[PDB]
Design an enzyme around this catalytic site. Structure first.
Site, PDB file in Angstrom:
ATOM      1  N   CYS A  77     -15.093  84.727 -35.679  1.00  0.00           N
ATOM      2  CA  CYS A  77     -15.722  86.040 -35.666  1.00  0.00           C
ATOM      3  C   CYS A  77     -17.215  85.742 -35.764  1.00  0.00           C
ATOM      4  O   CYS A  77     -17.745  84.953 -34.988  1.00  0.00           O
ATOM      5  CB  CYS A  77     -15.287  86.847 -36.894  1.00  0.00           C
ATOM      6  N   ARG A  81     -14.424  87.265 -41.847  1.00  0.00           N
ATOM      7  CA  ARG A  81     -13.869  88.264 -40.935  1.00  0.00           C
ATOM      8  C   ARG A  81     -12.808  87.783 -39.936  1.00  0.00           C
ATOM      9  O   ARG A  81     -12.126  88.597 -39.317  1.00  0.00           O
ATOM     10  CB  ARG A  81     -15.019  88.958 -40.190  1.00  0.00           C
TER      11      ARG A  81
END
Length: 276
Positions: A231, A236
């Site tokens: 990401c 994330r």
């Protein structure tokens, strides 16, 4: 069903284990102040940047530091650690990844996260626990689930030979190069885009093994390949890493913590724009 349903617990399971001496529940939120307003009884708070990150360099705390954190949290090597948080367990999945990076054998994620627990009206309290120190032996980092910048070039080739795959969990805009910032936009050559939220239902729970397989298999993201997920930051991409390795049973899945904040700022590295 899932490949590893044993690492996923229900809100019911958690409520019935609130007094299990071998269970330690931890709330891991992107919003480090949410826990203070109310949490699951007996649950402890994890402040990701302060607890998992080195204070000066871009790297996680050492194995030694991880062991001290665990003891302070009343966690031992044989403890059943249960994680939950806001944002469909986005950050809780990150903690899951980090615990596994440190080799913790029994880590579980509460399906639905804080969202579902609150929606159902289960017990909440602002009272913070006071557990006796745990006994946590110094762990050994498991490098098989972490990818580094110097592994990407050889991975990019593996992706072409059909021996590997790249999963970009960011928005399609960022993926295409229309884009935690970076001087360059696009994606790592060969990567396929599967926005992370596609793995969850509106109520915060994970989709079925069948629905999940449908997100990856049709795009060439199969178990026989070495997978690298990324990401902007590790925090994330951990959610999708979890989905692939544990819910779908992919044996070789790594989380590229450097992610785009590193790649999109690196000098002279390959970058692809548009669709792939």
């Amino acid at each position: 069903g899932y490949a590893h349903p044993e690492v996923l617990v229900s809100t019911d399971w958690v409520q019935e284990h609130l007094e299990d001496p071998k269970v330690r529940v931890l709330e891991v939120d992107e919003d480090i102040l949410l826990y203070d307003t109310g949490h699951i009884p007996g649950a402890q708070k994890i402040d990701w940047q302060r607890d998992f990150w080195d204070p000066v360099v871009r790297d996680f705390i050492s194995e030694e530091e991880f062991a001290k954190l665990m003891e302070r949290l009343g966690i031992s090597n044989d403890t059943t650690v249960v994680l939950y948080g806001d944002k469909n367990n986005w950050w809780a999945a990150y903690a899951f990844w980090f615990f596994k990076y440190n080799g913790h054998k029994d880590v579980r994620l509460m399906n639905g996260g804080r969202q579902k627990w609150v929606e159902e009206g289960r017990p909440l309290t602002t009272e913070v626990p006071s557990y006796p120190p745990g006994r946590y032996e110094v762990p050994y980092r498991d490098e098989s689930i972490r990818a580094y910048r110097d592994d990407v070039l050889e991975h990019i080739i593996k992706v072409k030979e059909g021996k590997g795959a790249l999963v970009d969990v960011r928005s399609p805009q960022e993926y295409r190069g229309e884009l935690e910032g970076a001087l360059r936009a696009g994606h790592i050559p060969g990567a396929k885009n599967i926005p992370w939220a596609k793995a969850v239902n509106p109520d915060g729970t994970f989709k079925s093994a069948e629905e999940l397989r449908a997100l990856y298999e049709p795009l060439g993201i199969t178990k026989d390949k070495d997978i690298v997920v990324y990401c902007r930051i590790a925090e994330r991409s951990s959610h999708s890493w979890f989905v692939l390795k544990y819910l779908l049973g992919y044996p070789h899945v790594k989380n590229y913590d450097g992610s785009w904040t590193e790649w999109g700022n690196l000098v002279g590295v390959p970058i692809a724009k548009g669709e792939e």
